[model samples]
Target: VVCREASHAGSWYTASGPQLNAQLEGWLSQVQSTKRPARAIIAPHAGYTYCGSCAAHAYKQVDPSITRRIFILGPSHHVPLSRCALSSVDIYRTPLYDLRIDQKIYGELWKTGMFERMSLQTDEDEHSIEMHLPYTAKAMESHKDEFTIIPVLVGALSESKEQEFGKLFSKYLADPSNLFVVSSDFCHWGQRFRYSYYDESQGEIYRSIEHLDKMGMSIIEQLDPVSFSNYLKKYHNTICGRHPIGVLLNAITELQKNGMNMSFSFLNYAQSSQCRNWQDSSVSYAAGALTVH
Candidate 1:
C-alpha cells in the first residue's frame, strides 16, 4: 500500500504502483545476498513492466549511508537533438517519496556549459530519468537529500556522433562523492519501436534482440566504449543512454588506471519479452554495479 508514483503516471513504463510494486517487490524479495556493493551502475530505462528487474539490481546494491547524490545520465526523448538538460524543479514526486534535486550539484554540472538552451518545458513529460526516482527514493529512504540526485538527459544526438562524448565526460565528470547511473535500454526491437533489426513481429523478434543484447552487454562489461559505439553503428542496436554508458566506461577506465580497483557484478537482467504481452518487439535491460574497494 506504499503509494506508487510512476505506476499509472505512465508514458511507456508501469502506469500503476500496486501492480508495479507487486512485480518489483517480487523481484526484490528474491535478492539473496546484497554484498560487495557498487560505486556506479549501468541500468536500463525501458518501461517498468519491461526492465524493472534490471534497474532494481543496481539500486539494491547501492549503500544509502554513504550516498549523498545520484547522478544519472538520462536518455533524450522530448528534445531529442537537444544537448543535456538539468532539472531545476524542487522535488520530483513519485509513489514512494518526494525526492529533491540537488541544486548545488545541478549548478556544478551546469557550470560545464555543455547543456543546451535551458528549458524546463522539455522535462514536462520526460520519463527516462523520472522512472528511476521512485526506486531510488525507496532504496535511500534511510536518508534524505543526503540522497539527492543530479539528472542529465542525452538528447537526440547519440554516441555514434563524432562528439566522442564518453571520452569527454570521463575527463570532466569528476566528483569524488557522486555515484552514476546511465539510463538506457538495449536493442529496442519489433515494429512497435520502429526499430526492428530483423524483419519480424512480437515475441520472436525479442529472440533476435536477445542475441544483440548479449553482444552489447559484453562490450559494456569490458568497458570498451569504442567497440560499443561501433557496434551500435554496425548493427543498429538501440541503446538509449549511449553517452552516459560511454562516459561511464571512460571514467572508470581512467579511474582503474589511477589505482581505482573497480569491482562489479551483474545483478539482474530482463527484456521486453517479459513485458508487452510477450511481444516480438523487445528491449533488453541489465543491472550492474561498479565499485572500487
Candidate 2:
C-alpha cells in the first residue's frame, strides 16, 4: 500500500505529468530504432535535462507489448552495502504514473536470502532508480497495468559477489517476457569528483573522457564481466553504477554459458558539460541496449 514518492521530480525533472510526457515523447521519437525489442538496456540516471535524449535511445528499443516485467538494477548512492536491496514500497510514483513492484518475484528472491529490504526513506532518497521511473512508465505506457518492476539497489559488491548475483538473476534474464534496466551514468570527471584521468593524445579533456567511457562501453558490449572489472580496477573511472553494470554483465555471461546468444551496443553518448580544464567538472551519459538474436 505504500507509495514511494517521486522525490526528485520537481528538481531533477519536471513534476507536471503532461510536460514530462511530452518531453519523453519528443526525445523518444527522434531516436532511430536500430535495435528492436531490447531484452535489456543500460541507460543513464542523471536528471532529465542532462541525459533524457541519450536515455530515450535505449528506451526506444523496448517492445512493451511483449515485455511483462522490468528488473531495474541501480547502484546505491545514499547507503553503503555489501549486497543488493529491494524496495520497501509497493508502488513507485512518477510524474507519468505509478509503477507497481513485482512482489511475486521479490518473494522468490527473498527465499534465497540474498536480498535485503530497503527502508522507505532509503527508497525515496535514492535518485538513481527514481530517475528512470518516468521513462519506464512512458515507454511501457501502452501496457502500463500489465507490467510490474523489480528495483534492486546494488551495492559495492566484490567480483565474486557480482558473479553470484548475476548467476542468481540469470534465469530471469533468460525469460523473454522480462526486461532489465541497468541504471548508471558513465564518467564523473574533474577535480570535483577527484578523478582527472586525461590522456593528452586524446585531445581535449572532454574528448579524453569520451575516449575513456567509450572504451568501457566497448568492453560492456563484449559481455565479459572479468574485463569490465579489470577496466574499473585499472582506470577507476567514476562510473557510479559500476556494480549494477557488473551484475548485469555477469548475468549475461551466465546465460551465455548456456548457449544463449546476446550482444550489447551503444546508441548515444553525451556529457553534462565539456571539461576544457581541470577546474571544470562533468558527468557523462551513454545509452545502450542488450539484444538477443
Candidate 3:
C-alpha cells in the first residue's frame, strides 16, 4: 500500500470546492442520474471537464443516502511506475472533502503480497486516482454519510495475470456488499497517441472508436473475463484498469456461483479531442453500472 498526500489539491486536480460542485451538477443533468444502483463503474480518468459527464453515468446510481464507501482503483498516468501502490494516511483530504482508508481490509491485503506501500509523494502527483474524486464528490455531496473512499493505483499496460488476480480478488471480495469500479477510458486515437487508425473527421473517428468500445462492451455484456484479458493481449489497451476490470469479472463469477447475477449498461461515451480533418489524439469516456441481482 502506498502512502498518500492530500496536499496536491491545486496541482493534480481541481482545488476549488464550489467550482467543482457546479461542474458536477451540470454533469448530473447531462447523464440524467445513475439509472440503477451499480456495484462497479467504468469511468474516464482525464481531467474533470473532459471526463466528468461520462463518470456521472455510473456514479449517479449512488443515491447519496445509500452509498457509504468507495474502493476507487486507479488508472496510472503521471506516476507511471510498475505495480499498484497504496495510500499511507488514515484519511485522504481533497480540497472540499476526505475519505477514510479501510485499514482492516488493507492490512489484510498487505499479507497477500499483491501490493506495495510507497510514500505519499508517488501517488499525489499522479492523476489516476485523484482525478476520479471530483466526480465522486459531484454525484454524492459532502454529507459524511454519503460516501467514503479508498484509492488504489493500477500501473502501466494490461496484464496476463488474470487467472491469478481473478482468484485472489474473488476470494477477497466474496461478500455481496462491496462494489467495484474499473477505472478506464477508451480508444486513444490520433497522432497524439501515435495510433492513426482514424483521421480528423468526427464520423471516421467515431466510427473507429465505436467499434473499439463495442468490443469492450461485449466483454462487459457477456460477463466474460477472457474477453477483456484477451483484448489487452491483442490491441495495446490505452486504458489502465484492464486488470481491475478483469478482477471484477472474477468476482462476478463467484457471485454467479452463489446465484447472484451481474449486469452492465453503457451509461455514456465520448472523446477528448477532435480536429477538422482527423481524430485528434482522443480519449473516449464511458459511464455504466454493474447491477447485481
Which candidate wins on TM-score? 2
Q: Per-residue error at 115 for model 3, in Å?
A: 1.2
lDDT of 3 by residue, 1-293 (tens): 33345555666456788776777777777666545566677777777767776777777775555556677887566665466667766776666566667787677667788777746676666666777666666556756654557667766534544455556666544443455567877777667677655423536656767767677777777787767777767766465567667766776776677777677778677777653346356677777787766
- The TM-score obtained by model 1 is 0.81
Candidate 1 has its poorest 10 consecutive residues by lDDT at 1-10
lDDT score for candidate 2 against the true structure: 0.93
RMSD of each: 4.8, 0.8, 3.2
TM-score to true structure, per model: 0.81, 0.99, 0.85
| Residue 247 lDDT (model 3) | 65
Q: After superposition, how far is residue 45 of candidate 3 from its true place, in Å?
A: 0.9
Tell me the TM-score of model 2.
0.99
RMSD in Å for candidate 1, one decimal?
4.8
Using lDDT as the measure, the top candidate is: 2
lDDT per residue as tens, model 2, 1-293: 48999999899999999999999999999999888789999999999999999999999999989899999999998898899999878999888889999989999998999988899989888998998889999999999889999999999999889989999998999998999999999999988788998999999999999999999999999999999999999999999899999999999989898899988999999999999977999999999999997
Give the worst 10-residue stretch by lDDT in candidate 2.
88-97
Clashes per candidate, residues 3 or more apart or on different chains: 13, 0, 14
- lDDT per residue for candidate 1 within 1-293, as digits (tens), equals 21113432656555555765566667666665464445677777766666776677777777778677787777777565645667656666675556767777677667877666435555656777877776777667778657777777776655543254454455433454567777777666666777756534424455556667777788877766678778878987777777667667767666666665665566676875533333455567878887766
Q: What lDDT is reached at residue 61 by model 2?
A: 95
